[PDB]
Each structure stands twice: as structure tokens, then as C-alpha cells.
């Protein structure tokens, strides 16, 4: 049984370790401090309550996101406006390798979409994914995110540029 809870500061070291092991983009300490303290970043952790060795509270998946103003986002021209509209930008999403292919990422995205639906001013959820990340791309397409843009040379990794795709899930009639 996988359970879900907000990220808290006891997750800090685990969160940092997973990120540097599964994302080629490197993040600074202040990002993780911001995630675990709550504040302006919203996040969900996935935990396996049955793990032994006292790791039954260690997260095995996560999603982090922030609320942005729609009018000041890169997809402002795509949205239909109605309070000031906002968007939820998914910052990072990942599942530990031995826990993949069980629907945990789908459940985490659903938690983000459910959250965003509950905000009347919210116009959708969007994210960037690196080109050729086929497991993630298939997931977003499976959950009805639309690819609206290919950003040439978006990511800088070890001195080389890689494309990203911008995926959007439109909400509340936007």
C-alpha cells in the first residue's frame, strides 16, 4: 500500500539524494529547503508503509510544484481567462526506480490536478520534460496533457543542449 502525504523537513536528505541521482539538472540547497518548509511550493510525497529496516516513512516518490500567475507565464496566449488566473507549474516529479510501473507517478499527478481543480482561479497545470524521456512523455500523454511547444536547446547538461517539450493540462474551462 502506497500512501501520500506532504513533504516535511525529515525528507530533506532523501529528497536531495533522489534528485541528484535521477535528474541531470542540478538544484541548489535553497530549492529543497523551500520544498520541505512548505510556503510557496506545494508538494506530495509517496511512501511505502511496508518497507522494513525503519524505512517505512522514507519517500519513494514525489512531485513538487509552484503557483504562478497565468498572465505572466510562457503559455499566457494559450489560456482562456475568467480573480487573477493562475497556473500550477510542476517543478520536479520522480519515482524511485524499484517502485516504477505501479501507477505511483499517475497518482502523484492526479494529486496535483485535484489540487489545482480546487482553486477557482486556476487555469491548468504545466511542466517541461526533456526530449527522448519516453516514460515521462507517455505518462503525460496518458493523462491528457497536450504538448504545445518544443523548446530548442532548453537544457544545459555537461556542455550540451537538449530540447524540452512543454506539456499543459487545461482546467476549469481554460
Amino acid at each position: 500500500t502506497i500512501c501520500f502525504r506532504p513533504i516535511n523537513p525529515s525528507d530533506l536528505e532523501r529528497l536531495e539524494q533522489i534528485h541528484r541521482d535521477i535528474f541531470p539538472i542540478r538544484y541548489e540547497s535553497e530549492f529543497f529547503q523551500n520544498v520541505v518548509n512548505g510556503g510557496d511550493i506545494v508538494s506530495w510525497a509517496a511512501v511505502d508503509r511496508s518497507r522494513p529496516d525503519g524505512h517505512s516513512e522514507e519517500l519513494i516518490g514525489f512531485v513538487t510544484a509552484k503557483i504562478v500567475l497565468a498572465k505572466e507565464s510562457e503559455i499566457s496566449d494559450l489560456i482562456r481567462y475568467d480573480g487573477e488566473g493562475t497556473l500550477v507549474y510542476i517543478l520536479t516529479l520522480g519515482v524511485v526506480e524499484t517502485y516504477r510501473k505501479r501507477g505511483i507517478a499517475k497518482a502523484l499527478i492526479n494529486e496535483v490536478v485535484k489540487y489545482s481543480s480546487g482553486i477557482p482561479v486556476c487555469r491548468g497545470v504545466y511542466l517541461h520534460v526533456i526530449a527522448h524521456n519516453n516514460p515521462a512523455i507517455r505518462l503525460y500523454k496518458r493523462m491528457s496533457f497536450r504538448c504545445v511547444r518544443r523548446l530548442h536547446g532548453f537544457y544545459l547538461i555537461n556542455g550540451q543542449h537538449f530540447d524540452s517539450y512543454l506539456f499543459v493540462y487545461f482546467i476549469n474551462g481554460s
Partner: peptide, 4 residues
């Protein structure tokens, strides 16, 4: 994955 948000950029750097």
C-alpha cells in the same frame, strides 16, 4: 524537470 524545471531548468537550472
Amino acid at each position: 524537470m524545471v531548468n537550472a
